[PDB]
């Protein structure tokens, strides 16, 4: 699908769950987030901070679209742009993209 996420600050092509967790803990704000490519094929994770905890959400890359749960988008950038304006977890929007912080 679309590759426009490759230059986004929040996107990390090579970042483990553990590395992602240690990055997010340095940022005491709900809505801190990043996206990382998973070892599983055609899969990403959104790692985010909410209620003082780190959570991870799977995103499946399937054909010309990406899927999070039952929500479907044209691309990963469209998905992130959506959840920057609409809450992903309770009332938390994706708010603070983490670029190595």
């Amino acid at each position: 699908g679309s590759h426009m996420h490759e230059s986004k600050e929040w996107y990390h092509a090579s970042l483990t769950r553990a590395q992602a967790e240690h990055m997010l803990m340095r940022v005491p704000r709900d809505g801190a987030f990043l996206v990382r490519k998973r070892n599983e094929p055609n899969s990403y994770a959104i790692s985010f901070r909410a209620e003082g905890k780190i959570k991870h959400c799977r995103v499946q890359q399937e054909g010309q679209t990406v899927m999070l749960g039952n929500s479907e988008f044209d691309s990963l950038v469209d998905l992130i742009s959506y959840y920057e304006k609409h809450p992903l977890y309770r009332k938390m929007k994706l708010r603070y993209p983490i670029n190595e912080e």
């Binding site: 959400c57 799977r58 977890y89």
Partner: peptide, 6 residues
């Protein structure tokens, strides 16, 4: 949840 669902 290992992965939060949604």
């Amino acid at each position: 949840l290992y992965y939060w669902d949604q």
